Amino acid sequence: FRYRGYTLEQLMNMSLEELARLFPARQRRSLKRGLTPEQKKLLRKIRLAKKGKYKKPIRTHCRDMIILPEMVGLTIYVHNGKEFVPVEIKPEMIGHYLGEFAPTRKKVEHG
Amino acid sequence: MAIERYFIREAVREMLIDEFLEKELRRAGYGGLDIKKTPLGTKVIIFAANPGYVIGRGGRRIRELTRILEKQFGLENPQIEVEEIKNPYLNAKVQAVRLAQALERGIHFRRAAYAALRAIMNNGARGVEIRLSGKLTGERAKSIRFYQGYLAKVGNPAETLVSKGYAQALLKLGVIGVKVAIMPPG
Amino acid sequence: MAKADYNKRKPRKFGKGARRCIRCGQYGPIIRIQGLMLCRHCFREVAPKLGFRKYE
Amino acid sequence: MGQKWKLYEIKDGKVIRKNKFCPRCGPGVFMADHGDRWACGKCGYTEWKK
Amino acid sequence: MQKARIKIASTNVRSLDEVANQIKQIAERTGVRMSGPIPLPTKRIRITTRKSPDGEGSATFDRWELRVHKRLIDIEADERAMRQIMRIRVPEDVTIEIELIS
Amino acid sequence: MAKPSYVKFEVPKELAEKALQAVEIARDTGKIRKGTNETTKAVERGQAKLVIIAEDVDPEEIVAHLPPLCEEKEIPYIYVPSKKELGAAAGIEVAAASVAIIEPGKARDLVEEIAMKVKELMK
RNA sequence: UUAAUUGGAUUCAACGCCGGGAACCUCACCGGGGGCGACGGCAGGAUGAAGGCCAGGCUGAAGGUCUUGCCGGACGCGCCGAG
């Protein structure tokens, strides 16, 4: 089609298992080897905004997430180890690493 | 595992009890530990100068000694014995300790070489040395050597054939490190 | 209400960060794990107990 | 030790029920009634108003 | 009779045929036919450590070595003979392993 | 409950010595409730067939409806002058200003002579 | 240069050296969330906990924090000597 995966809405129904194929080794790897309970609470935060009971905005220090569709269209405050940097999630960012999107320093050539 | 590695996995347990015993038996005076290890049970014969603080008041130390070995040891049937030290001067680990008592008092370096270098040699020895690293109660680091007989010699032979004791003698100004090396006759 | 709880939950189960020595309490030296569980500073003094020999 | 907590009601002559009683702990332990949700202080539960 | 392989590993040079020609003494309480001690290799363990904690500049690191020296003895005898040998094995010094086959 | 402001009957001492040993025998029978709040429930719901109460129970958050409640409920209440005398004889070992025995299956002898002495003379 | 790039070593006698394990750990350093002080002494004790807790509102996690309603049994915070 277009974008990363196919139509954003259609992908949500598919979610589990099917996403794996489209993306690299990393995203397959995270989902297959479980998570930690601190991550699992964040899964609940995202879920309440995209549907159902009242929103929780997603705060996270973790940069270990791999973007899922339910994260699209929402603003995630990720700690890079200094401060929180807001990130708006696009459909082009599905399957792509959280840590990429926020700089963890001000990175310029040295001079 | 292997039968090459069965001298690295019994020998370590012997190391562990030598380090803990020497410290907690300065109430009695320590000298050695003859540990005889059989699969039946580990029979440790503690050499100590005073028998009455290593048996306790009513088996007060005896309960401590039963409970200690079992953590360390794979043998869950320890027996305890106390033998007496019957020549404090023959052994280098009761002259390290005897010299440490005299230093902790303020009895100077030469005034305690009366009884740890003119008494040890009377007992019999091919050689003895006392070395005393520290600052010598100063503010800068210095050492002094006292030597009698053969106990340093060419090669490893006759200097790694010794009886060997180290003690700590604590000062309020520092630490002084106490080496007494007796090489028994032989 | 009440004072918080907190507990030790660091993933020390892999790497140098998992290891420790029973004889000096630390693992900041270059550790050895095959055989004995001790370090290089507890094998300068330990080695001829265990029948390791100095000579070559 | 203490200070300061009571939330037990006092009746005269008669008996009243302040709250619901846990069915997992028998009587003794009283549920907090928020609307539809039950709390239990004895062990700590998440409970819903059966 | 029952065949026993007594495999005897020792850290000492002179405790190895002194308990492999005088473990024939321990062993024999009934009749026995015994194989003279067959030397197996020295299996060699090295462990090399730095004696330097700082490591700096030029340095000399201690290469250690423990050589564990193996003799294998076969004996064909009763249950009682085998038992004598596994009843006592001193402080070790001498590791004694026993393998049992008919 | 009680207060030293509130006297309603006089507790004979002969009864009182054996009513601080009554609590102890009957603690390992069933349920034991202790502390003033706990004793409130034990009468509220009417579990206990005897409450024992030291006079020092304060403030009047507890006292409002509770002194008639024990009489209607048909249980005696018997006084200890101190909570450090109901706190060192009753089982409990840190002062208790009231305790309630559920099940006098083992203090039945003692605890029936209270209900015909501090519930005869005046309830 | 960066929030920080943790510290030492620094001619021989510092620079594949402690680091012959450097994603969190390691780790000392940095950033944000919470929090303990023994053993005696000191006012306090049952006038209920130091511990616990639904549900949303908030935390990277913890009734932790709030609104809100509620339990089981009973000694330790705070500090001052001094670990």
**Breaks (C–N over 2.5 Å) after residues, chain D:** none
The CA distances from residue A22 to A18, A29, A89, F25, in Å, are 8, 13, 18, 75
- Among the partner residues E51, E63, E66, nearest to C56 by beta-carbon distance: E63
Contact E49 C56 (CB under 8 A): no
Q: List the beta bridge partners of residue C18.
A: none
Contact C46 B8 (CB under 8 A): no
Name the nearest CA neighbour of E69 among B85, B7, C23: B7
CA distance D37 to chain F (A): 23
Name the nearest CA neighbour of D10 among F40, F100, F71: F40
- Among the partner residues B7, B36, B39, nearest to E66 by beta-carbon distance: B7
- DSSP assignment of C1-56 equals ------------SSSTTS---TTTS---S-B--SSS--BTTSSSSSTTTTT-BS--
DSSP secondary structure letter of residue A94: T
Per-residue b or e along B34-56, where b marks 16 or more CB atoms closer than 10 Å to that residue's CB: ebebeeeebbbebbbbeeebbbe
Contact D12 F69 (CB under 8 A): yes
- Substitution target in C21, C30, C40 with the highest count of E β-carbons within 10 Å is C40
Q: Domains in chain F and their CATH numbers?
A: 3-122 (3.30.1330.30)
Q: Of all protein residues, which has its CA closest to the C1' atom of G61?
A: A38
Q: Is D1 on the interface with F (CB under 8 A)?
A: yes
How determined?
Answer: cryo-EM
With beta carbons under 8 A apart, name residues in chain E contacting C23: none
Q: For chain B, which chains pass the contact test of at least 3 CB pairs under 8 Å? A: C, E
CA–C1' F15–G32 (A): 65
Non-local CB neighbours of C7 within 8 Å, separated by 6+ positions: none
Q: Count residue pairs from B and C with Cβ separation < 8 A.
A: 27
The secondary element (H helix, E strand) that includes residue F66 is: helix F66-73
The phi, psi pair for B63, rounded to 5°, reads -60, -40
d(CA B182, CA B161): 10
10 Å CB burial of residue B105 (0-12, 13-18, 19+) is exposed
- Touching pair E, C by Cβ (3+ pairs < 8 Å): yes
List all nucleotides in chain G with at least one atom under 7 A from a protein Cβ: 1-5, 8-9, 12-15, 17-27, 30-36, 44-66, 68-75
d(CA C9, CA C11): 6
- Touching pair C, F by Cβ (3+ pairs < 8 Å): no
Contact B7 E91 (CB under 8 A): no
The secondary element (H helix, E strand) that includes residue B17 is: helix B11-24
10 Å CB burial of residue B4 (0-12, 13-18, 19+) is buried
Asked if residues F4 and F55 have their Cβ atoms less than 8 Å apart, the reply is yes
d(CA F41, CA F107): 21
Contact C53 E66 (CB under 8 A): yes
Name the nearest CA neighbour of B178 among B107, B86, B87, B90: B107
Q: Of all protein residues, which has its CA closest to the C1' atom of G4?
A: A82
- Among the partner residues E11, E47, E66, nearest to C32 by beta-carbon distance: E47
CA distance E88 to chain C (A): 22
d(CA F77, CA F49): 10
Q: List the beta bridge partners of residue D45.
A: D40
- Using alpha carbons only, how large is chain C's radius of gyration in Å? 17
Q: Name the 3-class secondary structure at F7.
A: coil
Q: Count residue pairs from D and F with Cβ separation < 8 A.
A: 34
Contact B15 C49 (CB under 8 A): yes
With beta carbons under 8 A apart, name residues in chain B contacting E97: 3
CA–C1' C18–G6 (A): 21
Name the nearest CA neighbour of B145 among B94, B182, B109: B109
CA distance B55 to chain E (A): 26
Q: At residue F109, what is the residue type?
A: D
Asked if residues D23 and D50 have their Cβ atoms less than 8 Å apart, the reply is yes
CA–C1' A39–G51 (A): 28
Contact B6 E43 (CB under 8 A): no
